[PDB]
Amino acid sequence: NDKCKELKKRYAGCEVRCDXPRYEVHC
Structure with missing residues (x-):
């Protein structure tokens, strides 16, 4: 549940x- x-x-x-509640994955 610890999505971060x-x-x-x-x-x-x-x-x-x-x-x-927002997660921005920048690869």
Whole structure:
């Protein structure tokens, strides 16, 4: 449920911007 963590762990290298209910993955 920690999507910021999950995304920032899965996308090891990408710029995952966590902003509340918004997540911006910039690879």
